[PDB]
């Protein structure tokens, strides 16, 4: 809080100084007076320019906000990718006569796919809540939203309500109490609402509600001149897809006084701060909903053990009678011994679970649509030995026959696979079995019966090829069902390649196939057990190092994996990678093998199909070199001292020579590849210095960079050298007299080109950084080095500023560099060499040129009068 208040106070102070045209502040943080203490003229200039750009940004933001407040909300929502949906359920103005349940979710009309799950709230039969606790403290937050969800062309919230009570809302017969009947679906457009342009939590927008037909008072009573009506009543015979599309497309619904008051509020962030800073909207008892989707900000420790099973559609024939059988999915959780578990099914997120869960009821529909999503939570060890059954019980009109009749057909789904995998995500169909009632009740029997499409089809294929101990039973009916599985858990494995990596000892024949298929595996399923996969790869390349193609494919697979890790979506897992490097990385001889493999890679860079692989390897060199360094130091500490240190240093030197050869070969086919290789080469050498000789590394890099031709891609190599000087030059005890001449030579080559118009910024950055490392207080002796610098780094800057006397470019950087240079050196260096220049006429020319450049610098200075 102190830091943020200091920052905003300083910003407003500088804003006031700018608007009145007065003196602003310096040293934005920790004191604001610490800049004029001869700390760093370069840092002072950088503070100047960052302050100026902040001034421009704040003034343009003020100009934008003086008229419209649309950019601020978009910027706030684009700052992070973790949102929350807040529903202000005030009241539900209606009157039906049975218990009411709420089910809201997120649906995309254009993608025709649901996004979020559903949460249930107990509601009474006459517009009151069954539980008065949620009457006023109804605080719900639906998390797992990001910018890519908001960038949807049409964002809508789907709200469907299912009643609880009797079958019919009339008299004539008695019906069982405690069963569900769907009523209707209400959808509102929340496109502009989720953009946060107007914050109005008090406003409660009434949403028109559309339902299925329930009244026959006006539609059929008056029909004259042709009475011929032979039809039925459509109670629940409306497919959900078409009705949902029609409701979304509709602009107004004649609800006749039915609906509810809700307002949608978007609170950025997660439960860490919304329960403290947004306590007025998010209380402690706020329900949290987890969307069935992979997160965008994939942070470590994102615990989610939710198993989502969704019912969409299912074929149900009429059968013996013209009325199709009444089907309710009486599902329960069972272990390996078929024992019922308690509180494992959670239809609503944030509500207490139920041991047994039933489905909704349709009015004898041939192909009903369910769209029923429920969540199952089991222990990570227990879920590996659990089974789920789907018993379908026929329900009659009268309560006695409704409760006496048992499950006519029983379905089931396996949560594991014999090979080790889990149920793959995607559309899966189901087949229900009827007739016998004893073979589907003994738990030990139906463990190996067909209950899912893939296992059923593989069993029938095995029966076709070998009709022994496996035959297709004739108990199957003419009906079918469909389920949608999207398990957003952390211990599942929906990949045979994943287990093949895990248990390659069992199936080492398909190692080649596994390595080939590793190149298209989804990133999330990889990073779920990336540590295990990397350990398996390390073991594979350790104990099986006889076949060269195995090593090549393992190297390619690890390059692909580490490139995926280095992507913008997995910076949070990089600390996890480093922690695993420090704690579980047990490679001892893998470093030399990896070094030899990459030496072969660079020495054989001539292949065209190898271009992208080598580009990825060069991009991800940093982390693989971290791995190599860890393995080498582990070997050193386990063996005390390694006689292989000298040969590994020779291997590194040979790698540098191979890089020199790669630079020497024509650039016509590897422009971007060699540019990136130059870009990311010094990434690890800072850490390599800790174990390799700094003098040898410095001289090898000097030779490597002096071998670079000076005719192609000057800005890229200048940026590479900017990164070079930034790193390890502060450790100047052995890299002053070898690195400074290199910088001097490169700047001298930069000097006279007549095309240095964009190179000015790079030269300014180089000068700034070298001056920084020269004036650092943790350096020590810099007398002779600064002496040589002022010997050959003053006439050239004088000449450059004379050339760029034009007032358009960023002269101020050069001005800061030259003033820092002139002030840093004391009179001793001037007397030693600046006064000891060449012949008298030439020094007179020098003096007059200096006077001219001085009067031009002072004459019409081009600062921003700030």
The position carrying tokens 């045209």 is 21
- Alpha-carbon distance of 823 to 775, in angstroms, equals 11
Q: What is the full DSSP assignment across 385-443?
A: GEEEEEEEE---SSHHHHHH--EEEEEEEESS-TTS--PPSEEEEE--EES-SSTTTST
Give the C-alpha separation, 535 to 541, whole Å.
10
- DSSP structure class, residue 229: -
Q: How was this structure determined?
A: cryo-EM
Query: Residue 726's CB: how many other CB atoms inside 10 A?
Result: 16
**Is the backbone of residue 31 left (phi > 0), alpha (psi -120 to 50) or beta?**
left
Give the number of C-alpha atoms closer than 13 A to the C-alpha of residue 497, restricted to the C-beta side.
16
Both tokens of residue 635? Answer: 């070997």
Instruction: Confirm if 286 and 140 have CB atoms less than 8 A apart.
Output: yes
Distances (CA, A) of 625 to 490, 556, 559, 602, 652: 29, 15, 11, 15, 11
Alpha-carbon distance of 272 to 282, in angstroms, equals 11
Q: Which residues contact 104 (CB under 8 A, 6 or more apart)?
A: 87, 118, 119, 157, 158, 159, 160
* Integer angstrom CA distances of residue 431 from 266, 356, 451, 475: 43, 21, 7, 10
Find out whether 497 and 518 touch, Cβ atoms under 8 Å: yes
Contacts of 100 (CB under 8 A, 6+ apart): 92, 94, 123, 124, 125, 161, 163, 164
Q: Which of 114, 90, 112 is nearest to 104 (CA)?
A: 114
Please choose, from the candidates 810, 814, 789, the residue with its C-alpha nearest in 3D space to the C-alpha of residue 801: 814
CB 568 within 8 A of CB 537: no
Q: Are 264 and 194 in contact (CB under 8 A)?
A: yes
Backbone angles phi, psi at 644, to 5 degrees: -85, 0
Q: List % helix, strand, coil for the chain (3-state, nearest 5).
A: 45, 15, 45
Neighbours of 215 (CB within 10 A): 7
CB within 8 A of 117, min separation 6: which ones? Answer: 105, 289, 290, 291, 292, 308, 349, 373, 375
Q: Which two tokens stand for residue 107?
A: 């649906």
- Residue written as token pair 């789904």: 413
What residues contact residue 172 under an 8 Å CB cut-off, 6+ apart? Answer: none
Residue 268 half-sphere exposure, CB side, CA atoms within 13 Å? 15
Two tokens, residue 708: 């670079």
- Are 488 and 308 contacting, i.e. CB atoms less than 8 angstroms apart? yes
- The span from the CA of 719 to the CA of 765, in Å, is 9
Strands 264-266 and 210-211: unpaired
Here the contacts of 653-660 (C-beta below 8 Å, separation 24 or greater) are 653/696, 653/700, 654/599, 655/595, 655/598, 655/599, 655/602, 656/700, 656/701, 656/703, 656/704, 658/599, 658/602, 658/603, 659/602, 659/704, 660/703, 660/704, 660/707
3-state secondary structure (DSSP) of residue 485: strand
Q: Shortest CA distance to 492 belongs to which of 535, 525, 448? A: 525
What is the DSSP code (8-state) at residue 654?
H
């Amino acid at each position: 809080e102190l830091a943020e208040l200091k920052k905003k106070v300083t910003a407003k102070i500088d804003h006031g100084n700018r608007m009145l045209g007065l003196d602003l502040v310096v040293r934005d943080d920790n004191g604001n007076i610490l800049d004029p203490d001869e700390t760093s003229t370069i840092a002072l200039f950088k503070a100047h320019e960052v302050a100026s750009k902040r001034i421009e940004e704040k003034i343009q933001e003020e100009k934008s906000i003086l008229q419209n407040l649309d950019l601020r909300g978009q910027s706030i929502f684009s700052t992070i990718h973790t949102y929350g949906l807040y529903v202000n359920f005030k009241n539900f103005v209606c009157n039906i006569g049975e218990d009411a349940e709420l089910f809201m979710a997120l649906y995309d009309p254009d993608q025709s796919t649901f996004i979020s799950e559903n949460y249930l709230i107990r509601w009474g039969s006459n517009g009151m809540p069954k539980e008065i606790e949620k009457l006023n403290n109804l605080q719900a937050v639906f998390t797992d939203l990001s910018s890519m969800d908001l960038i949807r062309p049409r964002v809508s919230l789907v709200c469907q309500i299912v009643r609880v009570g009797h079958m019919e809302l009339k008299e004539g017969k008695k019906h069982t109490c405690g069963l569900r009947r769907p009523f209707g679906v209400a959808v509102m457009d929340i496109t502009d609402i989720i953009h946060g342009k107007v914050d109005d939590e008090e406003k409660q927008h009434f949403i028109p509600f559309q339902q299925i037909a329930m009244e026959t008072y006006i539609r059929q009573r008056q029909l004259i001149m042709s009475p011929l009506i032979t039809s039925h009543v459509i109670g629940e015979n409306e497919p959900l897809t078409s009705v949902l599309n029609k409701v979304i497309a509709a602009k107004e619904v004649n609800h006749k006084g039915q609906g509810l008051w809700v307002s949608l509020k978007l609170l950025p962030g997660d439960l860490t701060q919304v329960q403290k800073n947004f306590s007025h909207l998010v209380d402690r008892s706020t329900a949290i909903a987890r969307k069935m989707g992979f997160p965008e900000i994939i942070l470590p420790g994102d615990v989610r053990n939710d198993i989502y099973v969704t019912l969409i559609h299912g074929e149900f024939d009429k059968g013996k009678k013209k009325t199709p059988k009444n089907v309710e999915v009486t599902m329960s959780v069972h272990d390996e011994e078929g024992k019922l578990l308690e509180k494992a099914i959670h239809p609503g997120a944030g509500y207490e679970g139920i041991s047994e869960y039933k489905s909704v009821v349709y009015y004898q529909v041939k192909q009903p649509c369910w769209y029923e999503t429920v969540k199952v939570s089991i222990a990570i060890e227990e879920v590996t030995r659990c089974h789920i059954r789907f018993t379908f019980r026929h329900r009659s009109s009268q309560e006695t026959r409704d409760k006496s009749e048992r499950a006519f057909g029983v379905a089931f789904v396996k949560l594991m696979n014999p090979d080790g995998t889990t149920l793959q995500d995607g559309r899966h169909d189901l087949v229900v079995y009827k007739g016998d009632n004893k073979k589907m009740e003994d738990a030990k029997f139906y463990l190996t019966l067909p209950g899912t499409k893939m296992e059923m089809e593989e069993k029938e294929l095995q029966a076709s090829k070998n009709l022994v101990t496996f035959t297709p039973s004739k108990d199957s009916t003419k009906d079918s069902f469909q389920i949608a599985t999207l398990i957003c858990s952390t211990k599942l494995t929906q990949n045979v390649d994943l287990l093949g990596l895990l248990n390659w000892r069992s199936n080492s024949q398909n190692i080649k196939h596994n390595l080939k298929k590793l190149m298209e595996v989804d990133g999330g399923e990889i990073v779920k057990f990336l540590q295990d996969t990397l350990d398996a790869l390390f073991n594979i390349m350790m104990e099986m190092s006889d076949s060269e193609t195995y090593d090549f494919l393992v190297f390619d697979a690890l390059v692909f994996i580490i490139s995926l890790i280095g992507d913008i979506k997995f910076q949070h897992f990089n600390p996890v990678l480093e922690t695993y490097i420090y704690k579980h990385f047990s490679a001892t001889l893998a470093y030399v093998k990896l070094s030899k493999v990459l030496n072969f890679y660079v020495a054989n860079a001539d292949d065209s199909s190898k271009t992208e692989l080598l580009f990825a390897a060069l991009k991800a060199l940093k982390y693989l070199f971290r791995f190599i360094i860890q393995s080498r130091v582990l070997y050193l500490r386990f063996y005390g001292q390694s006689k292989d240190g000298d040969e590994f240093n020779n291997s590194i030197r040979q790698l540098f020579l191979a890089f020199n050869m790669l630079m020497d070969r024509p650039l016509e086919e590897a422009v971007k590849i060699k540019g990136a290789a130059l870009k990311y080469l010094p990434s690890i050498i800072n850490d390599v210095k800790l174990v390799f000789d700094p003098v040898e590394l410095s001289v090898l890099f000097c030779k490597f960079i002096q071998s670079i031709p000076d005719n192609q891609l000057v800005r890229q190599k200048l940026n590479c050298m900017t990164k070079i000087v930034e790193s390890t030059l502060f450790r100047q005890s052995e890299c002053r007299e070898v690195l400074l001449p290199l910088l001097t030579d490169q700047l001298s080559g930069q000097l006279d080109d007549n095309s240095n118009k964009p190179d000015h910024e790079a030269s300014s950055q180089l000068l700034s950084n070298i001056l920084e490392v020269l004036d650092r207080k943790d350096v020590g002796a810099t007398a002779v080095h600064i002496q040589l610098i002022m010997e050959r780094l003053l006439r050239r800057i004088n000449r450059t500023v004379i050339g760029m006397n034009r007032q358009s470019p960023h002269i101020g950087s050069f001005v800061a560099c030259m003033i820092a240079l002139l002030q840093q050196m004391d009179d001793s260096h001037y007397s030693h060499y600046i006064s000891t220049f060449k012949t008298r006429q030439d020094i007179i020319d020098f003096l007059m040129e200096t006077f001219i450049m001085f009067k031009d610098l002072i004459g019409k200075n081009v600062y921003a009068k700030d």
